[PDB]
Every structure is written in structure tokens, then in C-alpha cells.
Write a structure and sequence with these properties.
Chains C, F: This is Bacteriophage Mu GpT domain-containing protein. The structure is cut from a larger assembly and holds 4 copies of chain A (56 residues), 2 copies of chain B and 3 copies of chain C. In chain A, 12% of the residues lie in helices and 11% in strands. Chain A has 56 residues and is mostly loops. In chain B, strand 1 and strand 2 form a beta hairpin. The two termini of chain C are 39 Å apart. Helices cover 0% and strands 0% of the residues of chain C. Classes of the chains: A little secondary structure (56), B alpha+beta (207), C little secondary structure (44). Chains B and E meet through helix 1 and helix 7 of B and helix 2 and helix 3 of E.
């Protein structure tokens, strides 16, 4: 299963090509992989958070 | 004037305030205790908090009538007071004129019939949270006299929309009617600190 | 235009109102709503 | 004088509150032509026997 | 001045402080005791710890009203004080002026 | 290296600070809010 | 006028064939028909819900 | 810059063609221009707001 | 409107081409534009002054 998605149609901080944006709802809560990079990707839900597990 | 400083006019003392409200005297209690459930009791109390004292007063009357233990306790408590000797004393280190005034008042109260009934009616405020007794003023020449004391049901009053501690008569208007100065003896004992609606002992004893 | 003749001394008053609940005051001060932490510094 | 009268404009102004809430609602009138009959639910089934 | 030393101005004594807050006098208690659960009570207490005393005060009023034993105990305790005789005494080894003031 | 030689002796000092509001603590530890509604009991 | 609408991209339990999945259908607070089916279809929302005045 | 868009998740009053619909997320908060019409534009943020600067 | 011209054929400073002569009645007192240059233009009248508004 998926512990949480926290999407609400908003990611925390998806930073690519040297610029940090806010979209695509790529929020995860698990230590499967890239936890160090998961800190950077996550840790900034500017807007509301809605958790709807996908049971993946 | 009165103790509160409100201007006093002797013209209005010839007739009771409620005389021009003949509608009140024809009302009958609705007996809200019959078929009473906890939800109904909670609604009654909450509505009373908001200025609808009629239902609360009728419920309290029914509660007093239908419970023998509660009635016996309240009657014993009131009869305790009714049996106490009383006297009128002059103020601290009073002068001769003040002593004479106090003596005359004492003599007047001794010879005033219906004092015990007045005390009994006033003591109803212990349970109901407030008791109103209307005065009948008469002139036996040059000296005003209380002709009689009339106890008016608590269901005849309400709360001022602009003040939760001030009672008013039910005259079909949203704001009621202010109580006439020198026309009532309002007794509001304070068992608990709060507004007049919440101050009754029957509110504690209802559950 | 907009007339109405009514009694006032009757046991009933025309167009009777209903103050079912008082003028309760509803407020949004601080750590009582989300409008002020996960949102702008808004109060209603 | 001041070589920047625009900057000193905020310096030389003043604020006085006289129009603030210089108004009131019309006097209460429903008391004369209506009576409050508060209830405790979302309805009121009035009933009388004519 | 007052005991705490704060400056005292007699101009502000003509009117009560809350007179200019007519909104307060029109409020009604929310009765938070009805439908109260342990979680709700814990939240009420914690929020009161943080400066929201309104809910705590209303809950305390409801608690006083709805419990006969607690109300009787509190009333007895307070009536114990209300029946005590009291007097005003001058300070230690007070002078004639202080005695007159007392 | 962005140094700043300063006299700090005149009536004013360089880079003067402006304390508007203290560090009032903001908390979200009660079910009151929608964070615990929409999420697994997330306090803030 | 009908009072009752859900327009926050919110999730509700709508059952298509042998399963109940996210979808927005009736989404009203008033009912005159399909009450028994509406109950299954009108399961209150999972996520943020906000109402409007369709006045249809 | 745009100090606040006042757009996310909220919809404001927009009076156009004699009918005042609610859409397009035209929220703003500044004293740049059309300040008087700002009241009409922000006359109905019926839904929850969530500010986010566009740095315009 | 120009509420003060401050001219009275006064010798107002006009620093042009490295020399500050007095060419015409360039006296002005307003917060429209070029206040910093208004410093140089209206520094030294050097002669008697009298303002007569042009209502410009």
C-alpha cells in the first residue's frame, strides 16, 4: 500500500533545472528510497494537504 | 426618589402597572412538566437563558408541585425564615430624628397586615431565582399606605433584549415593559454568581 | 404605496417575529481556525 | 521652504475621526407592529381551536 | 496612584471600561458541557492553557449548574466566608492620622 | 567577503533592527482544525 | 432552489459495477428520488467539500 | 509586485454583462489601480482562500 | 495648478554648461518632478522674490 500521497493537487517543492516549483502533487511519506532527496522534494506543503492513499 | 435614583412620580401610584394589561390575568399555565424528556428540559433551560422565562417558570411550578421530597425541603427552608423575629434598627450612631423615623417605621410594619404572606411570597425567589410582588398604594389622608401585596407569577416577565439582568413585563412587545418604580418588591437571592435566568436553585435541582 | 393597518392592543401582534437565538458573535481570532496558520493572516 | 514638498506632504497632513460611524440605524420599529415568540427548533406548528 | 504604581488618571473613572464594548453585553453562553467527551474536555483545558478562557469559563459554569453535589459543596464553602464578621484595622503602631483614616 | 566597517557611535547604528512583534508561539495540537480532519492527526 | 453541491474536486463513493470508486454525481443535500441508491452514491465526502447555488 | 493573488481554492465576485458570476480567480490585494472596483471584484470570496504571490 | 512661481524677476540659479547663471524666471514650488534637480534650480534666489501663481 501507499502510506500517504498528500497531493491536494500540490507538491511540496519539485525543484528541477535549477528552479523550484510547486505542482504535480508528488508528495510521499515512506522510506522506500531517496529519503535524503525525499527531504528536499517534501518538507514544503505551502497549500493545504489532502492525504488519499493509492494503495500501491 | 428611589434607592437607584430613578425619578419618582406619585401620579402613577394610584393604579397598579398591570391594571392596563388585563390579558395577563386571563392566562393559564401550560404545564410543561407533563411528557418531559431530557432533550425537552435542555431546550427549556437554554431558551430561558435567552429571555423566555415563561416556560421555565411553569416547569418550576410543576416541579414544585409534583415532587413531595423537594416540596417538603423547600417548605421547611422557607418556614425556617418565616419563624424568625425581626426588628427595625436606626443607622450607625443615628440622631434623634433618625431614631424617631426608625421607630415610626417599626410601628408601621408591626401594624401592617399581610407581612408574613409578603415574606413567603418573596422567599419564592430562592427556587425561582426572582420573585415580584406588586404594591397597592392608597392615601388615608396625608400618609401613603401599602393597601395589599400581590404576588405575580414569574411567567409574566421576561429579559430585556439589551440587558440580561433586567426584568420586564410581557406587554406583547419585543422589549416588554420596564418595571414601575415603587410598584414592586423584587427579591433576587444569589446562590450562584451569574445572570438572573441562571440564578435559580430549581435549575440545579431539575436533573 | 406600502400601507398596513394593524391592531396594537390585541393579545396578538401582526407580523410577529421570532428571536429564536440571540445575536451570537462568531469570530476568527488566532489558533482557532486554519485561515491564520496554513493560510494568509486573514480573520473573519 | 522644502525642496521636496511631495515627501513632506505626509509630514504636514493630519487625520481626524469625525465621519467614522457618523451614522446610525433607523429606530427599532418591529416592537410596535410585531411580537417576539421565540422557539427552539426549525419550525412552529401553531394550533388553536377557533 | 495604585498599589502597583501605575499612573492613575481620574478622567477615565467617569465611565466603565466596558461601556465602549457594547458587543460583549449581547453575547450568550455556548454551553460546552452538553455532549462533552473526555477528548473534548482535554482539548478545552489545553486551549484554555493557551489563552482561550471563554470555553473554559462556560464549561465551568455548566459544571457548577449541572452537578448538585459540587454546587452544594461550593455554596457551603462560600457561605462559610459570607458569615464572618470583619473589621478594618490601622497599620502596625499607627499614628493618630492613620487611625482616623482607618 | 561582505564585511562592514561601522562606527556605531553616532545617534544611530547601521543595519538597525525593527522589532514589530515578538516570537508568539503558534500551535495546531487540537482536533479543532482541518489538519487533523484531512490528515492523520497532524499537529503543527 | 436546491441547497447542496460539492464542487471542490472532492471525492465521493459512487458504485459503478461491483465496486465503489471516487466520482461526483448527485452531490445534493435534498432528495426526492433514488434515496436507497443515493445513500450508497451520496456517502459524505472524503476530502474538502464546498457548496454553491446551482439554482437548477 | 503582486503582494497577494487571493485565488487558490477561493472564487470572488465578478460582475460582467449584468450578471455577476463567480470564476476565473481574479483575486488581488494592492493599491495599484481600480481600487474602487476592488470591492466589487472581492465582493464574494465565498470559498476558502489561499494566497500565493505571482511576483509580478 | 502651480500654486507658486517665486519668480519676481529673481536671480534663480540655473547651472548649465558648468556655469550657474540666471536665464529666466524658473522659480517653482511643487512636488511634481525633479525635486533633486529642483534643489539646484531653486537654491539661491539672490534677489527679491514674490510668488504669482500661473494656475498651470
Amino acid at each position: 500500500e501507499v502510506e500517504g500521497v498528500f497531493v491536494r493537487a500540490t507538491v511540496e517543492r519539485r525543484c528541477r533545472a535549477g528552479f523550484c516549483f510547486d505542482k504535480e502533487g508528488q508528495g510521499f511519506a515512506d522510506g522506500v528510497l531517496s529519503d535524503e532527496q525525499l527531504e528536499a522534494l517534501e518538507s514544503d506543503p505551502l497549500l493545504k494537504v489532502e492525504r488519499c492513499t493509492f494503495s500501491g | 426618589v428611589d434607592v437607584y435614583g430613578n425619578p419618582i412620580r406619585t401620579q402613577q401610584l394610584r393604579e397598579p402597572q398591570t391594571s392596563r394589561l388585563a390579558g395577563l390575568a386571563k392566562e393559564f399555565a401550560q404545564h410543561p412538566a407533563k411528557g418531559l424528556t431530557p432533550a425537552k428540559l435542555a431546550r427549556i433551560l437554554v431558551e430561558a437563558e435567552q429571555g423566555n422565562l415563561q416556560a421555565q417558570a411553569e416547569l418550576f411550578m410543576d416541579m414544585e408541585e409534583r415532587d413531595a421530597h423537594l416540596f417538603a425541603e423547600m417548605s421547611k427552608r422557607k418556614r425556617a425564615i418565616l419563624g424568625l423575629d425581626w426588628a427595625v434598627e436606626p443607622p450607625r450612631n443615628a440622631s434623634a430624628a433618625e431614631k424617631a423615623d426608625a421607630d415610626y417605621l417599626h410601628e408601621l410594619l408591626l401594624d401592617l397586615e399581610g407581612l408574613e404572606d409578603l415574606l413567603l411570597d418573596a422567599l419564592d425567589g430562592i427556587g425561582h431565582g426572582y420573585s415580584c410582588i406588586e404594591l397597592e398604594w392608597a392615601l388615608q389622608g396625608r400618609e401613603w399606605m401599602p393597601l395589599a401585596f400581590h404576588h405575580r407569577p414569574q411567567s409574566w416577565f421576561q429579559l430585556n433584549p439589551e440587558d440580561q439582568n433586567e426584568l420586564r413585563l410581557r406587554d406583547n412587545s419585543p422589549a416588554g415593559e420596564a418595571l414601575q418604580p415603587f410598584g414592586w418588591i423584587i427579591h433576587r437571592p444569589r446562590a450562584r454568581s451569574g445572570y438572573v435566568a441562571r440564578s435559580g436553585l430549581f435549575r440545579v435541582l431539575a436533573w | 404605496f406600502a400601507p398596513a393597518a394593524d391592531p396594537g392592543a390585541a393579545w396578538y401582534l401582526l407580523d410577529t417575529s421570532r428571536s429564536l437565538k440571540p445575536l451570537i458573535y462568531q469570530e476568527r481570532m488566532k489558533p482557532s481556525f486554519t485561515s491564520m496558520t496554513k493560510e494568509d493572516d486573514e480573520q473573519v | 521652504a522644502i525642496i521636496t514638498p511631495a515627501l513632506i506632504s505626509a509630514l504636514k497632513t493630519s487625520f481626524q475621526k469625525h465621519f467614522q460611524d457618523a451614522l446610525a440605524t433607523a429606530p427599532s420599529t418591529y416592537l410596535q407592529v410585531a411580537t417576539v415568540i421565540p422557539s427552539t427548533t426549525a419550525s412552529n406548528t401553531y394550533g388553536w381551536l377557533g
